[PDB]
C-alpha cells in the first residue's frame, strides 16, 4: 500500500503493521509513536501539495 | 439532480475480525489495480466504544480521483459500517457506497451494500438547451411575424 506522498509510505507501513496487531489482538491507542510520525508526514505533505502552489504563485514579485 | 440506487448482498465465510482487518488492508490486490494510494486521516475510539476511522484513497480510470472512506467498527455488536464517496468531480457524478457487515447462525459475515449514483449534469444540459431554445424562439418568432407583415403587404 502506497501513500499519496511517497516519502510517507514507509512510516505509513510502520503505522499500519502496529495498528493491525493492535486491532486483531487488543481491540477485537498503543501505536501512538508511529501514528505521530505518519500523521506528521501526511500533514506536511497535505500542506505542501494543497497550500504551497498558491503561495509560490503569490510569491511572484521582485524578490 | 439525477439519483439512482442499487443494492446487493454478499456473504463472506469468515469471522468479523478477519473481514474487518481485510477491509482495512484491502490494497494492493490483483482485483483492484486502479487504487494508487491509501492514507489514514483519522482513527479513534469513540465515546460509545466504536472505532471511527476516516481514510483517503486515490484511484485511476479512463483520470485520477480522490475518495473519502468513513468506517465505524462496533466490536461489542461485531458490526461494521463503511461509506465511500469521491471528493472531486462531484459536479459531474457522485458515487456513494454504503455497506454493512454483521456476524453466527451461518457463522458468516453478511455484507449488504448499496450504491447511490447521482449525476448533476442533468441541469447543466437543461440550461444550455434552455438558452438554445430561447435563441431559436426569438429567431422563429421574428421570422414568422416578418412573413405575416410581408403577406399583409400584398
Ligand atoms: C468520480 C468517480 C467516483 C470514483 C469512484 O468511486 O469510482 C470507483 C471506481 C472503482 O472503485 P471500486 O468501487 O473500489 O471498485 O474507480 C474508478 O475507476 C474511478 C476512476 C475515475 C475516472
Residue numbers in the entry:
A (entry chain A): 6 to 33, 40 to 74
B (entry chain B): 0 to 61, 74 to 114, 116 to 166
Describing publication, verbatim:
Mdm35 is another conserved yeast intermembrane space protein belonging to the twin Cx9C protein family. As the binding partner of the Ups proteins, Mdm35 facilitates their mitochondrial import and protects them against proteolysis. The role of the Ups1/Mdm35 complex in lipid transfer was first reported in 2012; thereafter, Ups1 was recognized as a lipid transfer protein mediating PA shuttling between mitochondrial membranes.
To investigate the mechanism underlying Ups1/Mdm35-mediated PA transfer, we attempted to obtain the structure of PA-bound Ups1/Mdm35. Both Ups1/Mdm35 and Ups-Mdm35 fusion protein were co-crystallized with PA with different acyl chains, including 1,2-dioleoyl-sn-glycero-3-phosphate (DOPA; 18:1–18:1), 1-palmitoyl-2-oleoyl-sn-glycero-3-phosphate (POPA; 16:0–18:1), and 1,2-dihexanoyl-sn-glycero-3-phosphate (DHPA; 6:0–6:0). Although we obtained DOPA- and DHPA-bound Ups1/Mdm35 crystals, only DHPA-bound Ups1/Mdm35 crystals diffracted well. Two Ups1/Mdm35 molecules were present per asymmetric unit in Ups1/Mdm35–DHPA structure. The Ups1 molecules also form a domain-swapped dimer. In Ups1/Mdm35–DHPA structure, each Ups1/Mdm35 contains a DHPA molecule with high real-space correlation coefficients. Residues V66–G72 at the α2-loop could not be assigned because of a low electron density, suggesting the high flexibility of this loop. The phosphate head of bound DHPA is proximal to the positively charged R25 side chain, and the H33, K58, and N152 side chains are adequately proximal to facilitate electrostatic interactions or hydrogen bonds with the phosphate oxygen atoms. The sn-1 and sn-2 acyl chains of DHPA were stabilized via hydrophobic interactions with T76, I78, M104, and V106. Structural comparison of Ups1/Mdm35–DLPA and Ups1/Mdm35–DHPA revealed that DLPA is inserted deeper into the positively charged pocket than DHPA. However, in Ups1/Mdm35–DHPA, Mdm35 αA and αB helices interact with a Ups1 molecule, whereas its αC-helix interacts with another Ups1 molecule.
